[PDB]
Amino acid sequence: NDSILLGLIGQGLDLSRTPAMHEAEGLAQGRATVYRRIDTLGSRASGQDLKTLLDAALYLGFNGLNITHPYKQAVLPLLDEVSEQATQLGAVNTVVIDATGHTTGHNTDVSGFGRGMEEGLPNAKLDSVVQVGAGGVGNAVAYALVTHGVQKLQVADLDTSRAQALADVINNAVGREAVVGVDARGIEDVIAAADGVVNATPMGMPAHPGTAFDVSCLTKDHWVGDVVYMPIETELLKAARALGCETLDGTRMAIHQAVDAFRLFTGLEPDVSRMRETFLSL
Amino acid sequence: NDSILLGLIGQGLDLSRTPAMHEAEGLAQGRATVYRRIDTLGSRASGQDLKTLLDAALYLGFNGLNITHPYKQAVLPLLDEVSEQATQLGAVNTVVIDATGHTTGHNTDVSGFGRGMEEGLPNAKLDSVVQVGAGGVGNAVAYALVTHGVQKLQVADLDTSRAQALADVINNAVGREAVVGVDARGIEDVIAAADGVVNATPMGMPAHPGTAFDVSCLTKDHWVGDVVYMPIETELLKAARALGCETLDGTRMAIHQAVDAFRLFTGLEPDVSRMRETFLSL
Ligand SMILES: NC(=O)c1ccc[n+]([C@@H]2O[C@H](COP(=O)([O-])OP(=O)(O)OC[C@H]3O[C@@H](n4cnc5c(N)ncnc54)[C@H](O)[C@@H]3O)[C@@H](O)[C@H]2O)c1
Ligand SMILES: NC(=O)c1ccc[n+]([C@@H]2O[C@H](COP(=O)([O-])OP(=O)(O)OC[C@H]3O[C@@H](n4cnc5c(N)ncnc54)[C@H](O)[C@@H]3O)[C@@H](O)[C@H]2O)c1
Ligand SMILES: O=C(O)C1=C[C@@H](O)[C@@H](O)[C@H](O)C1
Ligand SMILES: O=C(O)C1=C[C@@H](O)[C@@H](O)[C@H](O)C1
């Protein structure tokens, strides 16, 4: 019945649904659970170095942390151990803290997106996929794609250098040329020839209305995924659904990263439907 | 329904009943509550300076802390504000942390012992009392005694200097010569002439069996108190009860310090009977 203490280190955390998911699921399994935002833009933690905040969590009896932007790369050298996937990606979003203070980094963005593919695109054809966007979440998405059956992934970003760096990282991680950086300009023709496409840009959010490419390149035979989870039905996914395409909405990864982290943090088997419920309720 | 995060900074905390009391009462009032030991003898926090640990709690989203030995004096200069009672005593056991990180020190050992007198000795004659022991908890007990109606308190300690320092601190706090240091040797004759006596030494604990003075000096008309709370019925209180004396057991202060701190930490009205229940159940 031991209480569970967790937090999230990052910037601009007020709207995160991750604390609620973990607090509700802990309680549902008979464990009082606190999950605190540790926001370096906020009044409590501003100006503090990542190492200070990590060490604080160790001293205070935290059982785990999530890590978000801008710290998912910076955190790695601070940890005692890092999983092979998080090591090869160079990004950790989950830190398990042992009873006595030892830290292990994991990446449940990767495992969560992969689980979302299994759950929401079980029959998808994976030979050729395009991903638009190579930022933060895009790196984990790309790794997930090519580890969950994608043979060739073409990644486009306005910043070609980001796409090519992504490709190098993932290809090294997997040990094959799974990923190719391609130009953003003319990406429609590349998507048209592919089996599926994933949006890993901010486009579709209320503050970034529209789509990252012209949806007229889609066909009924494509599948389409999106990382954006608010709104759940982005303009891109609306356009795909209108053609009869299978779609993967961004809530799947957002929920499953938390499912997977909860399991790592606690050793308990999370109830996916309960955590999904909490996510959707906020 | 916001979750509550609390801890205790001190040494040798495994057997504290304070975390359980606060966790259970938070939950009973519909708030998931974590209360962590922050033990500088343990694996998480050893070697860290008090200031490091206090700052950690601020950064991490703690709502409050208790402070125990050896830090109840050292903590004062680290806090933004300290209550008048804790300031004059020179000892803080409770730190309220505001939403945005500001700290206020309080002393609920003082308020808790006083409440115990009201609750368990409502009819006690208070003109002349003896206290044996001037350590850590003894300072708070002495302040409580003379602020809850004791006219003259005689404090004995094997270390006369500790008793006289206590007397100076309390007398300054109250603004009268309420307390006098007296020799431990011959304390029985002093107790015999007094209305009541309080044990503030370790005597009566399993590892300190016996009594701090010869109980043959007690009469049926005395009242007797004890700070020791395990066992609840110390040899001293057994001897008092055998004569028909009213007695004050150490659980009252131990419970009420937590009642009072919970109120300060949360702004909720604690249920005393529930917290007492939790205490006794451990
Ligand atoms: N599902 C989830 O769990 C989850 C979690 C966090 C964030 N997100 C979403 O992921 C989005 C991306 O997050 P991020 O932190 O990687 O953002 P980021 O800004 O670091 O990366 C976005 C990338 O998209 C590129 N881009 C923008 N428009 C483009 C276009 N038209 N064509 C090609 N590239 C384009 C940018 O150059 C940038 O490199 C966020 O806006 C958020 O909506 C989802
Ligand atoms: N009720 C409660 O909430 C509560 C909380 C914490 C501790 N305690 C109890 O309080 C006891 C005292 O705690 P402390 O931290 O102040 O201990 P301490 O060791 O700092 O102080 C005890 C004092 O008793 C004196 N002493 C010992 N035997 C004596 C004797 N025969 N005559 C005169 N003086 C004597 C010592 O010289 C010392 O100064 C603990 O052992 C514990 O059982 C009670
Ligand atoms: O702040 C959020 O909502 C989160 C964002 C992602 O970085 C996740 O990986 C993190 O665990 C939770
Ligand atoms: O560790 C304990 O059991 C405690 C001891 C006293 O110092 C109290 O004042 C503190 O709040 C809790």
Curated annotation (Swiss-Prot), chains A, B:
Active-site residues, Swiss-Prot/TrEMBL: K72
Domain of life, source organism: Bacteria
EC number of the protein: 1.1.1.-, 1.1.1.24
UniProt xrefs under Gene3D superfamilies: Leucine Dehydrogenase, chain A, domain 1, NAD(P)-binding Rossmann-like Domain
Keywords for this protein: Amino-acid biosynthesis, Aromatic amino acid biosynthesis, NAD, Oxidoreductase
Induction of expression: By shikimate, quinate and QsuR.
Residues holding NAD(+): G136, V137, D157, R162, P202, M203, G204, M205, A212, V227, G250
Residue numbers binding L-quinate: S16, R17, T18, T68, K72, N93, D109, Q257
Residues that coordinate or bind shikimate: S16, T68, K72, N93, D109, Q257
GO molecular function, one term: shikimate 3-dehydrogenase (NADP+) activity
The keyword Ligase is annotated on this UniProt entry: no
General function of this protein: Involved in the biosynthesis of the chorismate, which leads to the biosynthesis of aromatic amino acids, and plays a key role in the quinate degradation pathway. Catalyzes the NAD(+)-dependent oxidation of both quinate and shikimate to 3-dehydroquinate and 3-dehydroshikimate, respectively. It can only use NAD.
UniProt miscellaneous comment: Has a different substrate and cosubstrate specificities relative to all other known bacterial shikimate/quinate dehydrogenases.
Name of protein: Quinate/shikimate dehydrogenase (NAD(+))
Species of provenance: Corynebacterium glutamicum (strain ATCC 13032 / DSM 20300 / JCM 1318 / BCRC 11384 / CCUG 27702 / LMG 3730 / NBRC 12168 / NCIMB 10025 / NRRL B-2784 / 534)
High-level lineage: Bacteria, Bacillati, Actinomycetota, Actinomycetes, Mycobacteriales
